[PDB]
TrEMBL record:
To H.influenzae HI_0845. It comes from Shigella flexneri. It comes from the Bacteria. Gene3D superfamilies: Protein of unknown function DUF1040 (1.10.1580.20). This is Protein YihD. InterPro entries: DUF1040 (IPR009383), YihD_sf (IPR038134).
Amino acid sequence: MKCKRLNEVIELLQPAWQKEPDFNLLQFLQKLAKESGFDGELADLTDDILIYHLKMRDSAKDAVIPGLQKDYEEDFKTALLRARGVIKE
């Protein structure tokens, strides 16, 4: 309702967060931000960063790009099978 932060992330980040909805607003955001190599802390993480980031991969569906999609695939599968058994992995 009153969280414009929630609204704009559910605009472009909607599919991404539906792959991992267990993490909270700042918890999912701090994950993807630290994988982007965020220098600041998530308590200072501006919505401008997230929205711009998820719009890059959104515009990759149809853009000026000459076959160059560019979406840095994490081997979370590696970390996942390496962890195993724990409730969240």
